[PDB]
Design a protein around this ligand. Structure first.
Ligand SMILES: CC(C)CCC[C@@H](C)[C@H]1CC[C@H]2[C@@H]3CC=C4C[C@@H](OC(=O)CCC(=O)O)CC[C@]4(C)[C@H]3CC[C@]12C
Ligand SMILES: CC(C)CCC[C@@H](C)[C@H]1CC[C@H]2[C@@H]3CC=C4C[C@@H](OC(=O)CCC(=O)O)CC[C@]4(C)[C@H]3CC[C@]12C
Ligand SMILES: CC(C)CCC[C@@H](C)[C@H]1CC[C@H]2[C@@H]3CC=C4C[C@@H](OC(=O)CCC(=O)O)CC[C@]4(C)[C@H]3CC[C@]12C
Ligand SMILES: CCCCCCCCCCCCO[C@@H]1O[C@H](CO)[C@@H](O[C@H]2O[C@H](CO)[C@@H](O)[C@H](O)[C@H]2O)[C@H](O)[C@H]1O
Ligand SMILES: CN[C@]1(c2ccccc2Cl)CCCCC1=O
Ligand SMILES: *[C@@H]1O[C@H](CO)[C@@H](O)[C@H](O)[C@H]1NC(C)=O
Ligand SMILES: CCCCCCCCCCCC
Ligand SMILES: CCCCCCCCCCCC
Ligand SMILES: CCCCCCCCCCCC
Ligand SMILES: CCCCCCCCCCCC
Ligand SMILES: CCCCCCCCCCCC
Ligand SMILES: CCCCCCCCCCCC
Ligand SMILES: CCCCCCCCCC
Ligand SMILES: CCCCCCCCCC
Ligand SMILES: CCCCCCCCC
Ligand SMILES: CCCCCCCCC
Ligand SMILES: CCCCCCCCC
Ligand SMILES: CCCCCCCCC
Ligand SMILES: CCCCCCCCC
Ligand SMILES: CCCCCCCC
Ligand SMILES: CCCCCCCC
Ligand SMILES: CCCCCCCC
Ligand SMILES: CCCCCCCC
Ligand SMILES: CCCCCCCC
Ligand SMILES: [Cl-]
Ligand code: NA
Ligand code: NA
Length: 540
């Protein structure tokens, strides 16, 4: 028999810690500022109500009924789409390649914070070149275009050492400091998810609830600051005319789908361990509302601190938050923390928040892949979950050996934009179409009624058959036609970077058509018999 969760709060906190991550602490406030303001919460809630939330509930109920991973459920839903599972696996190898190393940066920052004076306050250090001017109106104020804040120098010349990498063309060298700081992270991850869901479910009691104990302290500190009101009044001020631009809705859809994550193959893995009669409706509602409210509150703390630091300089906002990426956590917020009264305590606390914020998501992705593979091939890797988790962790670390180089930030951005792009959305769209159209939403509603005790309402069937595919289609058709012009640390990505990104995404996607061709060509029969007997779920 499978290994059930052992306690319901284990499942709740696992999903809650997987939904909240290092992205929505820097990505949601930046996105809310850039795309409107308080007028972005309307498209956020509109694309959450009809978008991420019904897909979230669909995946949870599907996994909890079929009791399989993401490579084996398709044996009893639509056998031709089994390739989806493989695609999901590949996607993890990309995300776990870069996501982990971001936490590595955080860990290094935390190791740097154990000093009486934080290293990114003064700029008389070794890595700190000219063009500093000490920032924050320190002594003589001659802030020019060539000047650079000390935290920027610390991030891009000590933690990253990106100045010894000419660019994405030459990723010269490799940081041994970051290599150690990520070997420790992978040790933590593997020893937290190795024994399965009986240990990875009690670990997330302290890495999915510590970020809240830390957000509370960070919020109470930020709110009682000089310049908090300007930091919030520039976060919730509605640019209503911004709603008229399709980009705002496109971005709200992308944000909700990539913060809830309905389609990465992890919700099925977590829900498959649930008891049969477990209420997935209440779990989906609670762990989606908690995700959305956590994103909102994290935006509050980020913007209150930003407003404080912009009021200290007595200069306007939107030039403080120039950088659109993890730099915001390591260059801007680190600066504002370094100017706080008890700078050391809040630096340590903030980077502990970041590490515990990313750890749950890494646990969840890795365990989704582990469950999928452990269930697809049950005879091999049965009494050896530990060895397979070891192989998964080693493979992820070896794939993360490139983002640890000096041009590490370049590959981190390249994997951040691609990999998790139209490939993930296409996989999720094929999942929604396979369950709702092929397996039939009437049979899915019969399954959900025999589990929960009530058939899904008309809203759920309408949002599963029609609106949710017509939402992933919106995101996909809007990501493909508009190609990004990537940039990071005054580096214009080359021509071949977009080709490399397209190949990165296609490597993930091509798992689906390949398996479709394989199954249609190996199956005996005529021209139509192949598809008719490859759509019907396999008899037990
Ligand atoms: C971000 C800051 C400013 C707000 C702090 C929010 C937390 C205090 C909340 C958010 C999510 C909550 C958790 C969400 C899920 C659950 C599962 C719940 O478990 C049950 O299902 C038990 C129900 C019962 O039988 O009474 C126990 C509370 C707990 C851990 C909650 C405890 C309180 C938490 C951490
Ligand atoms: C603006 C201020 C007052 C903050 C208060 C917001 C909450 C009261 C709302 C905002 C979004 C809501 C959620 C958005 C989506 C839904 C789906 C909804 O599903 C349905 O069955 C809806 C049926 C229908 O819409 O006809 C159940 C409630 C829930 C979780 C909502 C619960 C209540 C939430 C958190
Ligand atoms: C010391 C540094 C420089 C190298 C790190 C090596 C790791 C890849 C190894 C070393 C110790 C290993 C663990 C020690 C022993 C085993 C038992 C091994 O056998 C089982 O399947 C145990 C089954 C059971 O628990 O009964 C499974 C892998 C595991 C847990 C290992 C997981 C991988 C670890 C961390
Ligand atoms: C169905 C066949 C497709 C299989 C895979 C084909 C590979 C195609 C890869 C194309 C890569 C585009 O990758 C995608 O580009 C969009 C375009 O805005 C960028 O997306 C970016 O802008 C959007 C707004 O639109 C926001 O959500 C956010 O600021 C960021 O994600 C990212 O870079 C990536 O999400
Ligand atoms: C892309 N980010 C996610 C993720 C999934 C699996 C592994 C790592 C990560 Cl980072 C995708 C699902 C929503 C939030 C989550 O962090
Ligand atoms: C600042 O940087 C520019 C090039 O980015 C360089 O030419 C200039 O000499 C630097 N200033 C100082 C004081 O080092
Ligand atoms: C009528 C329901 C609209 C829901 C809007 C939620 C976010 C609005 C925040 C308050 C406006 C500044
Ligand atoms: C992140 C990669 C997921 C799939 C795991 C590949 C390696 C499995 C073991 C192969 C060597 C024995
Ligand atoms: C119940 C919460 C579990 C938190 C993570 C494991 C803690 C183990 C402590 C004993 C070994 C040092
Ligand atoms: C996100 C906070 C809760 C949203 C609704 C959860 C539904 C639980 C059923 C009982 C509500 C009182
Ligand atoms: C029984 C499984 C057969 C699968 C054949 C092809 C799988 C996808 C290959 C795409 C590149 C990894
Ligand atoms: C694609 C699965 C069935 C393969 C049968 C032969 C198809 C050959 C013509 C299409 C080539 C693109
Ligand atoms: C709570 C799920 C059902 C919501 C109502 C759907 C139909 C609305 C009236 C046409
Ligand atoms: C040599 C075989 C490589 C894998 C073939 C997968 C099916 C091809 C369909 C035309
Ligand atoms: C995660 C399991 C990968 C299996 C891929 C099979 C492809 C055969 C060519
Ligand atoms: C970093 C956590 C590792 C936990 C392993 C426990 C080993 C005890 C002998
Ligand atoms: C049975 C040993 C499990 C050890 C869990 C360690 C968790 C580290 C974060
Ligand atoms: C019943 C679940 C209790 C969770 C408490 C975790 C607190 C960790 C600091
Ligand atoms: C004990 C099993 C370890 C297998 C490591 C595989 C690494 C693949 C790159
Ligand atoms: C310069 C030291 C490199 C450390 C990593 C190489 C072996 C994993
Ligand atoms: C139940 C709807 C399935 C999709 C319809 C496609 C018509 C060509
Ligand atoms: C889009 C194809 C749907 C087929 C459903 C199964 C046949 C009734
Ligand atoms: C097939 C069950 C009801 C579907 C409602 C309409 C979807 C477009
Ligand atoms: C999307 C709502 C459809 C309602 C039609 C069926 C009412 C019994
Ligand atoms: Cl969010
Ligand atoms: Na999130
Ligand atoms: Na987390």
């Amino acid at each position: 028999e499978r290994e059930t969760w052992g306690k319901k709060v284990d499942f709740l906190l696992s999903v809650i810690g997987y939904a909240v991550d290092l992205g929505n602490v820097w990505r949601f406030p930046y996105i809310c500022y850039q795309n409107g303001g308080g007028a972005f919460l309307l498209p956020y809630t509109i694309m959450a109500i009809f978008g991420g939330i019904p897909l979230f509930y669909m995946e949870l109920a599907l996994g909890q009924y079929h009791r399989n991973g993401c490579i084996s459920i398709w044996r009893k839903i639509c056998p031709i789409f089994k390739g989806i599972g493989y695609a999901i696996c590949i996607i993890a190898f990309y995300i776990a390649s870069y996501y982990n190393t971001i936490m590595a940066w955080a860990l290094y920052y935390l190791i740097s914070s154990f000093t009486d004076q934080l290293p990114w306050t003064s700029c008389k250090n070794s890595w700190n070149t000219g063009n500093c001017t000490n920032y924050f109106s320190e002594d003589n104020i001659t802030w020019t275009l060539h000047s650079t804040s000390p935290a920027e120098e610390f991030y891009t010349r000590h933690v990253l050492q990106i100045h010894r990498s000419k660019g994405l063309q030459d990723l010269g060298g490799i940081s041994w400091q970051l290599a150690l700081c990520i070997m420790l992270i992978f040790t933590v991850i593997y020893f937290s998810i190795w024994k399965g869901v009986k240990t990875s479910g009690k670990v997330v009691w302290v890495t999915a609830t510590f970020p809240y104990i830390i957000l509370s302290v960070l919020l109470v500190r930020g709110a009682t600051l000089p310049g908090a009101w300007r930091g919030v009044l520039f976060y919730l001020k509605p640019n209503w005319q911004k709603l008229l631009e399709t980009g705002v809705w496109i971005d709200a859809a992308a944000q909700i789908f990539f913060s809830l994550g309905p389609g990465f193959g992890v919700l099925l893995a977590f829900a498959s361990y649930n008891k049969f009669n477990n209420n997935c409706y209440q779990d989906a509602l609670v762990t989606s509302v908690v995700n959305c409210m956590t994103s909102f509150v994290s935006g509050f703390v980020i913007f209150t601190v930003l407003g404080y630091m912009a009021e200290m300089r007595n200069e306007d906002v939107s030039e403080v938050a120039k950088d659109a990426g993890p730099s915001l956590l390591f260059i801007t917020y680190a600066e504002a923390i370094a100017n706080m009264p008890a700078s050391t305590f809040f630096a340590i606390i903030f980077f502990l928040m970041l590490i515990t914020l990313g750890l749950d998501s890494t646990f969840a992705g890795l365990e989704g892949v582990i469950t999928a593979v452990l269930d697809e091939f049950p005879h091999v890797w049965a009494k050896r979950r530990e060895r397979f988790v070891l192989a998964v962790v080693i493979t992820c670390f070896f794939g993360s050996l490139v983002t640890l180089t000096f041009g590490g930030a370049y590959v981190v951005k390249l994997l951040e934009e691609y990999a998790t792009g139209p490939a993930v959305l296409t996989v999720a769209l094929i999942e929604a179409v396979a369950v709702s159209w092929f397996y039939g939403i009437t049979q899915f509603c019969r399954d959900v009624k025999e589990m929960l005790g009530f058939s899904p309402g008309w809203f759920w069937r309408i949002c599963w058959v029609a609106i949710s595919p017509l939402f992933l289609l919106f995101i996909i058709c809007s990501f493909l036609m508009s190609p990004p012009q990537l940039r990071l640390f005054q580096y214009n990505y080359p021509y071949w970077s977009i080709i490399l990104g397209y190949c990165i995404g296609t490597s993930s996607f091509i798992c689906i058509p390949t398996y479709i061709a394989y199954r249609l060509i190996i199956t005996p029969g005529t021209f139509k018999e192949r598809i008719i007997k490859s759509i019907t779920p396999e008899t037990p």
